[PDB]
Design a protein around this ligand. Structure first.
Ligand SMILES: OC[C@H]1O[C@@H](O[C@H]2[C@H](O)[C@@H](O)[C@H](O)O[C@@H]2CO)[C@H](O)[C@@H](O)[C@@H]1O
Length: 334
């Protein structure tokens, strides 16, 4: 029995890689990592991949066996340690995202999934597919169209492959209600969870509003100096609504509600593919958030995967495969 309830992400390997290099690809994640994860009690890993390791924009259609080898070996390592694997396309063709504008990008997208479905057709227990990681559109109309075509295409080849489908605006829990009705029994609905953003992403070097705010935040606790911050930076005036907001478990439960309600109606399976706290947050707060959040997922029977195994500013493990906090790993392995 393979399960997909308590996992961890493998970001930074064949997705969001620093430089496209074999050295990186061959050493960032090796079997020793999958073993560590397995010994820790996680039941699966989420593997984001960016299209270019599989297909080049020039000779569109020729799939690189050198890139695929990494996914293959990871599947082997997982099979060996009885872990599940959620293969996730993090960066699609064209997705300044032309994917929903250019039918050619759409064709390539579907073809890559058709290829993978065929390639792993004999693996029935250890792998699941996550079509597109985070969409950011005015509305769900175009993604719904692309998604339905992709599901259709995959079903022609594999009728029982579990597919993980997320909604608009970074797989937001309240955008699930805007997805097209997929009449299919092998679908799991995905949503990401990083609430409260200024706590989970405090001082995030890649977040302009978070870098501008440049404020340490505790949890439980509350946002401080928002009023004084907006005064100085009228550009982030929208942040005024977060003024003195109290961060606590009931706050987290309120943000999760949209997903819970969607499931009431669809009677479907939910999954939170990404959730976490930037590693520079004080340890006590960081542990407390995960404990509170994991607690809610347990309560509502939702599986998920914490961001991130190593590196990517959200590390759970040091580069020497030792956890940053053992109590944290225990909470996360459920
Ligand atoms: O590349 C930007 C930034 O991404 C960070 O990870 C993301 C994750 O991939 C994304 O799906 C979600 O919306 O947010 C997380 C956390 O911001 C990663 O942690 C950074 O190192 C990276 O620079």
């Amino acid at each position: 029995m393979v399960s997909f309830k308590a996992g961890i992400n493998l970001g930074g390997w064949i997705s969001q890689y620093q430089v496209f290099s074999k050295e990186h690809f061959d050493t960032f994640i090796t079997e020793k990592d999958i073993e560590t994860i397995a010994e820790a009690g996680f039941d699966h890993v989420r593997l984001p991949f960016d299209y270019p390791i599989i297909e080049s924009d020039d000779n569109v259609g020729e799939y690189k066996e050198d890139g695929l080898s990494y996914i293959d070996r990871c599947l082997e390592w997982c099979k060996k340690y009885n872990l599940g694997l959620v293969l996730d396309m993090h960066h699609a063709p064209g997705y300044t995202s032309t994917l929903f504008e250019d039918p050619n990008q759409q064709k390539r997208f579907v073809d890559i999934w058709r290829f993978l479905a065929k390639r792993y057709i004999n693996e029935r227990e250890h792998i699941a597919f996550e079509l597109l990681n985070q969409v950011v559109e005015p509305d769900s109309t175009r993604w719904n169209k692309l998604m339905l075509e992709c599901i259709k295409a995959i079903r022609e080849i594999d009728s029982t492959m579990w597919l993980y489908i997320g909604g608009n605006n970074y797989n937001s829990p309240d955008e699930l209600k805007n997805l097209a009705d997929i009449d299919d029994d092998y679908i799991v609905y995905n949503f990401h969870f990083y609430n409260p953003f200024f706590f989970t992403h405090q001082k995030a070097h890649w977040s302009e509003s978070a870098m501008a705010y440049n404020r340490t935040v505790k949890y439980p606790g509350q946002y401080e100096g928002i009023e004084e911050f907006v005064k100085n930076n009228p550009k982030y005036s929208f942040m005024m609504e977060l003024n003195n907001l109290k961060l606590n478990k009931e706050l987290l439960r309120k943000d999760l509600k949209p997903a819970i309600e969607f499931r009431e109606k669809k009677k479907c399976k939910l999954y939170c593919g990404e959730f976490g706290v930037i590693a520079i947050a004080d340890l006590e707060s960081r542990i407390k958030w995960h404990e509170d959040y994991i607690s809610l997922l347990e309560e509502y029977d939702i599986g998920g995967a914490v961001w991130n195994y190593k590196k990517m500013d959200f590390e759970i493990y040091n580069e020497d495969r030792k956890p940053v906090s053992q109590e944290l790993v225990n909470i996360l392995a459920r």
